[PDB]
């Protein structure tokens with residue numbers, strides 16, 4: 320037993336990380352088949368970033384202005400193009416470590432693993448959630464741009480995030496692998512509002528089911544509630560409204576534990592109204608919302624990948 | 626910026642995981658050069674585990690009783706031996722993916738990454754700490770035994786933990802890679818006491834320095850204290866006593882932030898005496914002790930590996 324915030328094994332993604340240099344700026348790229356993907360602001364000087372005309376800036380660049388380095392293997396760039404906020408550098412060599420992969424645009428509330436990288440070399444791996452306001456709460460320094468977020472289904476890597484920027488909150492924003500930002504953000508150094516975040520209710524419930532599976536059951540109360548009744552409590556506390564789609568998603572956990580979803584909701588409602596009274600759940604003094612129902616099920620059934 | 630519990634990239638370790646079967650029992654092994662390492666209780670039936678005579682049980686086994694499977698690559702066993710609580714199976718093939726590696730016995734309070742595995746295939750990666758009472762708080766199911774904990778120094782993997790068992794607390798116990806248990810535990814299905822745990826004071830301070838580096842400074846108070854004065858508060862709250870060795874280890878963080886260690890101690894003392902008053906630090910409502918000073922420094926300087 321036990322419950323931990325667990326990332327996917329990162330080996331398949333490690334084999335795809337490269338270093339991309341244009342001028343003095345160096346960031347990370349993702350090398351898949353014969354294409355390297357990276358944030359387009361690799362082409363900017365520090366001054367360009369205040370208000371870059373990326374088309375005009377890219378026109379001044381040629382294939383040989385982009386240095387792509389894979390460890391010490393070094394790639395010849397034979398084509399470049401800009402797709403939304405990413406550059407696609409065509410290289411003369413297919414990555415021999417390319418895994419089976421897909422590009423996906425994830426939904427708010429979903430989770431993924433981030434492989435944090437600098438100069439094209441992995442530093443660490445951690446799990447997180449796409450917030451309802453399309454930010455993530457990551458750990459990113461200068462040079463981390465181009466680091467990617469991903470999920471694994473057995474042998475297939477689904478890439479879902481590429482890091483671009485940090486917002487005036489310490490929160491992080493980026494794009495999918497077609498270069499479209501999650502949320503309203505643009506790749507410019509100018510003040511930008513994230514907007515109000517909300518707590519991912521279905522993930523909190525999943526985590527309460529995790530707790531029960533692992534022996535933590537003090538919060539299991541006596542009451543029940545209704546969807547509307549619970550949803551009134553939800554928006555008081557800036558939780559996303561629960562839907563029948565969410566109830567259905569929680570079905571397997573409900574069947575494993577014998578606790579109806581609406582009964583679990585009544586426990587959550589009391590936790591929101593009364594706090595935790597200095598107690599903890601699964602080692603936490605806060606209600607955790609960065610585990611999806613699938614995350615809980617994979618961790619309590621031992622799903623593997625390779 | 627931002628601060629996350631970050632594991633090491635696991636690719637180098639993924640390449641070493643194998644499946645070991647003896648009779649009906651299947652667990653994970655670590656394949657390095659031409660030796661596979663795994664918990665010796667792979668040789669036990671469910672009934673043997675109540676009080677196994679491992680020498681007597683191992684005598685009934687021959688090389689061909691051990692099935693070692695690496696993905697679908699399958700290894701010929703040409704020798705076996707028991708070292709403390711691990712078996713060493715000699716195989717006829719050196720692992721072509723063997724990284725530069727070392728076997729280390731870590732100290733309580735240190736951290737390492739765990740690659741959780743089932744049937745020889747990685748499921749997830751997460752960071753944790755060797756508690757002062759030589760347990761870890763992991764996430765481990767049936768079949769996870771033989772999963773390993775490790776640290777990376779650039780290209781060298783230092784293996785420090787192999788998982789063996791779960792204790793009547795939901796906590797986990799295991800050995801180093803020479804098969805010596807951390808703590809007083811034995812590999813027998815019989816009730817076993819872990820003993821009182823304590824909070825790792827130097828790690829809490831490191832995490833408070835992390836917080837200041839990342840803008841969380843509300844807890845920075847006005848007071849100072851002394852080592853003895855703080856150490857009296859420490860043992861009231863079952864924190865390890867702080868030593869001058871710990872003060873020196875915190876030197877670089879003290880120099881980066883301009884906060885004397887004893888000033889930070891005075892903040893910690895007030896947090897222990899008064900609680901957090903419903904506030905959070907780095908997204909947590911509890912004082913976190915599973916980041917070492919080195920962990921903080923690597924995450925706030927961007928150290929990479931390959």
Ligand SMILES: *[C@H](O)[C@H](C[C@@H]1CCNC1=O)NC(=O)[C@H](CC(C)C)NC(=O)[C@@H](NC(=O)OCc1ccccc1)C(C)C
Pocket residue numbers: 346360368459460461462463464465483484485486487491505506507508509510511626
């Ligand atoms: C690329 O690796 C780099 C990663 C960030 C450095 C520190 N943390 C990070 O995640 N990203 C950048 O340098 C971007 C480049 C832009 C997109 C052209 N810049 C930023 O992330 C800045 N943030 C920003 O401009 O957001 C708007 C803003 C916020 C606050 C105040 C003014 C503007 C960041 C370095 C401030």
Ligand SMILES: *[C@H](O)[C@H](C[C@@H]1CCNC1=O)NC(=O)[C@H](CC(C)C)NC(=O)[C@@H](NC(=O)OCc1ccccc1)C(C)C
Pocket residue numbers: 320652666674765766767768769770771789790791792793797811812813814815816817
């Ligand atoms: C091997 O993969 C397995 C992993 C554990 C299964 C569930 N969680 C795990 O980490 N380990 C075992 O099956 C060991 C085998 C022993 C060492 C021969 N057994 C256990 O971990 C049991 N724990 C145990 O015997 O500890 C003492 C005890 C505790 C509580 C009550 C009675 C005895 C565990 C399966 C209870």
